Design a protein around this ligand. Structure first.
Ligand SMILES: COC(=O)CC1CCN(Cc2cc(CN3CCC(CC(=O)OC)CC3)cc(-c3cc(Cl)cc(Cl)c3)c2)CC1
Ligand SMILES: *[C@@H]1O[C@H](CO)[C@@H](O)[C@H](O)[C@H]1NC(C)=O
Ligand SMILES: [Ca+2]
Ligand SMILES: [Ca+2]
Ligand SMILES: [Ca+2]
Ligand SMILES: [Cl-]
Ligand code: NA
Ligand code: NA
Ligand code: NA
Ligand code: NA
Length: 471
């Protein structure tokens, strides 16, 4: 195997490193996987399709302009280069290799397109028409953005967009399911908590956070239990950043944020899908859980879950490992059909006050076709009133003792509107048996005499009842 000759490939430290602080992408390339035959679409502000490092892989069938309602996602050029982000992300996935220009994509033989959707008013319909673009041609969608990362917003896909997610994972990709890769957010400095973003909090999105070059949680990171895994991105000014294609046929070394991590994950997922085109959307999440690596990622919340995997709310299961992903994909056995066990828990509304604990022992739909002994995602769908929402912290403890933070205190969130059946999601109990006692904790983290009521707590379990590995 001959590594890329591109002039900035040596600067793509998160691919080209020899110090073990990388995504182990060369190992996948050397196994023969480069993204050939895979189609990825960047949902963003457009894609410079004539970029000298993108044109060779550009796919009009992976592209659309839902802002101006036309097929051509060319960015709108402005003096401040506002609409450059999709071009940066496209190059992360699929910049052409060995062509003397900039660097390379993770999946440098994949086909790449973009949906121009962010350069205009983003409505439910705009979102739905983007997520649902050409779903039997595009394999993987990469989305780096969502509701405002101001640390006070609770929002997610409205009806058309949620319908697009279910159509995508159900009928997309020939019934194997569209793979939606999401950035978990850039709201770290606002103390944002990313389960309050319904896109990344969705089970249908494969959510990705960031690590700095030196292995730390970047200033912009949001912690939450819905995150699955991590890719490298930017950090402080002594740490390198992401090197990629840039608007106006240029090359940048200063692409940043969690919004730069999702495209790298989408590229690794493209290599993995080349290794096994039959992988379902759930198979892909299983591969990520099993192969991601905590080592050398620094966080104070690494915890071992009930099946012996380390998990963090900053990193999920750790750094993506492309070599391991493609290796495990090759002989992967398709997971059983997804079961869903609904457990409505409260017999009466519960005053929250300073602190509320709700304990419930469940059988996880024992005796039913939705009996789950092998958890995938779990949700606590909560309906509650509270006078100041951001003073709440919420935790969910599984029978195996895994404490998932569902909501951390958000100091800027002054809302008196509470949560209306908000489906806080955790990935941290993946592969655990969910039978037994679950504990919900709701706490007022402020000294204020805050008040409210929990009126609904629905525990929703997803998963299967066969095929477990030894912990
Ligand atoms: C009843 O109907 C409704 O309520 C319809 C609503 C429509 C808006 N929805 C949230 C939303 C917003 C934006 C726009 N904007 C926000 C600021 C951000 C930057 C930042 O946070 O700076 C601190 C940049 C994005 C975008 C995306 C988005 C993005 C991608 Cl890439 C894909 C998809 Cl599907 C959606 C989603 C909620 C539903
Ligand atoms: C894909 O997986 C399904 C489910 O296991 C199986 O029925 C089908 O034969 C597989 N197709 C290929 C091409 O491997
Ligand atoms: Ca256009
Ligand atoms: Ca190149
Ligand atoms: Ca956020
Ligand atoms: Cl469902
Ligand atoms: Na975001
Ligand atoms: Na997700
Ligand atoms: Na544990
Ligand atoms: Na149990």
């Amino acid at each position: 195997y001959q590594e890329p000759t591109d002039p900035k490939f040596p600067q793509q430290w998160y691919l080209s490193g020899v110090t073990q602080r990388d995504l182990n992408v060369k190992a996948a390339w050397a196994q023969g996987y480069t993204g050939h035959g895979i189609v990825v679409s960047i949902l963003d502000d457009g894609i410079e399709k004539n970029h000298p490092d993108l044109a060779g892989n550009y796919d009009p069938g992976a592209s659309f302009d839902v802002n101006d309602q036309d097929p051509d996602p060319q960015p709108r050029y402005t003096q401040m280069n506002d609409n450059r982000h999709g071009t940066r992300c496209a190059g992360e996935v699929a910049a052409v290799a060995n062509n003397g220009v900039c660097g390379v994509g993770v999946a440098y033989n994949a086909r790449i397109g973009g949906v121009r959707m962010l350069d205009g008013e983003v409505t439910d319909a705009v979102e739905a028409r983007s997520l649902g673009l050409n779903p039997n041609h595009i394999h993987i969608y990469s989305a780096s953005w969502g509701p405002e990362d101001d640390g006070k917003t609770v929002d997610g896909p409205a009806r058309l967009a949620e319908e697009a997610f279910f159509r995508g994972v159900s009928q997309g990709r020939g019934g194997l399911g569209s793979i939606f890769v999401w950035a978990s957010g850039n709201g770290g400095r606002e103390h944002d908590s990313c389960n309050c973003d319904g896109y990344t909090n969705s089970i249908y999105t494969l959510s990705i956070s960031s690590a700095t070059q030196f292995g730390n949680v970047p200033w912009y990171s949001e912690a939450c239990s819905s995150t699955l895994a991590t890719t490298y991105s930017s950090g402080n000014q002594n740490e390198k950043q992401i090197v990629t294609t840039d608007l106006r046929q240029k090359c940048t070394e200063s692409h940043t944020g969690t919004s730069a991590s999702a495209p790298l994950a989408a590229g690794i997922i493209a290599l993995t899908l080349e290794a096994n085109k039959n992988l379902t959307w759930r198979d892909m999440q299983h591969l990520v859980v099993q192969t991601s690596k905590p080592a050398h990622l620094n966080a104070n919340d690494w915890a071992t879950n009930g099946v012996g995997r380390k998990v963090s709310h900053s990193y999920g299961y750790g750094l993506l490992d492309a070599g391991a992903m493609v290796a495990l994909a090759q002989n992967w056995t398709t997971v059983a059909p997804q079961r869903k066990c609904i457990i409505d828990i409260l017999t009466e509304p519960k005053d929250i006050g300073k602190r509320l604990e709700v304990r419930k022992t469940v059988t996880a739909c024992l005796g039913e076709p939705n009996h789950i002994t092998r958890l995938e995602h779990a949700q606590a769908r909560l309906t509650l009133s509270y006078n100041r929402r951001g003073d709440l912290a919420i935790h969910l403890v599984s029978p195996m003792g895994t404490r998932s933070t569902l909501l951390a205190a958000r100091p800027h969130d002054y809302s008196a509107d509470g949560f209306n059946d908000w489906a806080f999601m955790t990935t941290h109990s993946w592969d655990e048996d969910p039978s037994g006692e679950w504990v919900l904790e709701i706490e007022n983290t402020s000294e204020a005499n805050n008040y409210g009521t929990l009126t609904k707590f629905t525990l929703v379990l997803y998963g299967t009842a066969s095929g477990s590995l030894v912990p």
